[PDB]
Amino acid sequence: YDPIHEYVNHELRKRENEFSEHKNVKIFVASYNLNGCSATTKLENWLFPENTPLADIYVVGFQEIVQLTSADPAKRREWESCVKRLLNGKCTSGPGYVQLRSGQLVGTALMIFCKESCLPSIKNVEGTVKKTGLGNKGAVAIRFDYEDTGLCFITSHLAAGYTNYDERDHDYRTIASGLRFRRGRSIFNHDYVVWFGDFNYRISLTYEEVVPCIAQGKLSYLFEYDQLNKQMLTGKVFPFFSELPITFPPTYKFDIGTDIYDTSDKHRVPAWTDRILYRGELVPHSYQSVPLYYSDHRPIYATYEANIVKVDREKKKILFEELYNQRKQEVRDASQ
């Protein structure tokens, strides 16, 4: 401990604008449990849902690239090619988007694209995966620094089952403790973290109770029975993560190709299985499901603005030393 050093950091904090520049980066986060459906570029409603500018960074997570009943890199690459074609298709003049990196754990995959113009700012990209224990479930994560701000993205597919939310909570803990990038870096060591996917948490009511409530728009009532909300409220899972209020209907269990909830004999209770949660000072904007019908789940997305800082380290070290000396001499004089 050094009092003079503390003093300097305190003062310097007041003069940050002298060695720091701040910028807002737009980030589009998209999630889709595919039920093993084929890759296609017909995703416009999902990836360009709003009448707003294209994002700087697109973070796309898929579950069940192979329908669940050994990891297919080929199928993941078809999706990569489809997303890239779609993003560049909107870039009629000049530079488009490039894939920074992708990762995969069995049927779960995460791929991140950014504008070519963002590339010079992106550094220390790392990726890792972690399977769940208590198998085809788990997480895929990619992190990177954008100038001097650290971001970490995680997509997952957690334990399936109507009542086994204790196993999903266990999966959360397994992944939060188990995901490690280079040199033991954890997911929490970042300014912004977005963790999302098919967490599989369910609404704890019966099919016959839930369906008419959905049809009647009683989403607030149903959310009172959502297992994820219940476990987050107690700090048991995803502590310090936030979720925007859900204004869209349960994204799971639909007959494929239709607006109809599961009419199979399995009469699966609808649920908000697909979620996007964030930790850190992101500014959230949208959070919605989109009407694509290729799977028994609807895809979802969330948008954010992320404040980025670029620090002139050289210029800051100089001010620091100057302020530090000035203060040490001041204390010297006071002793005289």
Ligand X SMILES: O=P(O)(O)O[C@@H]1[C@H](O)[C@@H](O)[C@H](OP(=O)(O)O)[C@@H](O)[C@H]1O
Q: Is 37 in the site for ligand X (CB under 6 A)?
A: no
Cβ atoms within 10 Å, residue 329:
10
- Beta-carbon contacts of 101 under 8 Å, excluding residues fewer than 6 positions away, are 111, 112, 125, 127, 142
CB of 24 to ligand X, least distance (A): 38
Q: How do strand 192-198 and strand 274-279 relate by DSSP bridges?
A: antiparallel
Q: Choose between 54 and 160: whose C-beta lies nearer to ligand X.
A: 160
CB of 62 to ligand X, least distance (A): 15
The residues in 284-303 that bind ligand X, with binding defined as CB under 6 A, are 296
Helix (H, G, I), strand (E, B) or coil at 149: strand
155: phi then psi, degrees, rounded to nearest 5: -115, 150
Q: Which helix (H) or strand (E) holds 283?
A: strand 283-289
Is residue 45 within 8 Å of residue 290, measured between CB atoms?
yes
Q: Choose between 115 and 157: whose C-beta lies nearer to ligand X.
A: 157
Question: Tokens standing for 261?
Answer: 């909830």
Cβ atoms within 10 Å, residue 256:
12
Residue type, 280: G
> Binding segment for Ca ion among 33-41, 75-83, 176-184, 257-265 (CB under 5 A)?
33-41
> Binding segment for Ca ion among 27-35, 84-92, 211-219, 310-318 (CB under 5 A)?
27-35
Q: Is 35 in the site for Ca ion (CB under 5 A)?
A: yes
Please return the burial class of 209, using the count of CB atoms within 10 Å of its CB with bins 0-12, 13-18 and 19+.
middle
Cβ atoms within 10 Å, residue 17:
8
Residue type, 161: G
The whole-angstrom separation of Cα 219 and Cα 225 is: 10
The binding track of 258-287 with respect to ligand X, each residue x by CB under 6 A or -, is: ----------x-------------------
CB of 66 to Ca ion, least distance (A): 11
CB of 35 to Ca ion, least distance (A): 5
Q: Is 188 in the site for ligand X (CB under 6 A)?
A: no
> Binding segment for ligand X among 155-163, 219-227, 286-294, 325-333 (CB under 6 A)?
155-163
CB of 162 to ligand X, least distance (A): 3
| 160 touches, from Ca ion, ligand X, none (C-beta below 5 to 8 Å by class) | ligand X
Which member of 42, 44, 81, 162 binds ligand X (CB under 6 A)?
Answer: 162
Which member of 160, 244, 309, 319 binds ligand X (CB under 6 A)?
Answer: 160
Is residue 12 within 8 Å of residue 320, measured between CB atoms?
yes
Q: Which residues bind Ca ion (CB under 5 A)?
A: 35
Which residues contribute to the site for ligand X (CB under 6 A)? Answer: 160-162, 268, 296
